[PDB]
């Protein structure tokens, strides 16, 4: 019979220095580190793809 150790879960730092563990919850709670003013999309494809 051998033994197992435990390694503590790491943290990922979100906006205004808010530590968390899950990326989705940290984003839904605080938000990304830097702010883009917006995203301009260039879509190339058929008409159905554009729709």
């Amino acid at each position: 019979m051998k033994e197992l150790i435990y390694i503590e879960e790491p943290k990922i730092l979100f906006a205004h220095g808010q530590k968390c563990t899950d990326a989705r919850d940290g984003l839904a709670l605080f938000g990304p580190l830097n702010n883009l003013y917006g995203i301009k999309s260039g879509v190339i494809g058929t008409k159905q793809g554009l729709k």
Copy 2:
């Protein structure tokens, strides 16, 4: 005794279908034709240049 003819000043088209003759007045009255979200400025040079 020679004669001079006259030609009407052309109009430039601004936001929401509004025309004018001066670019500055048209911009200050109706704004640009298109809509960006922001301008991400990259600066290259000295520290005092950044200041």
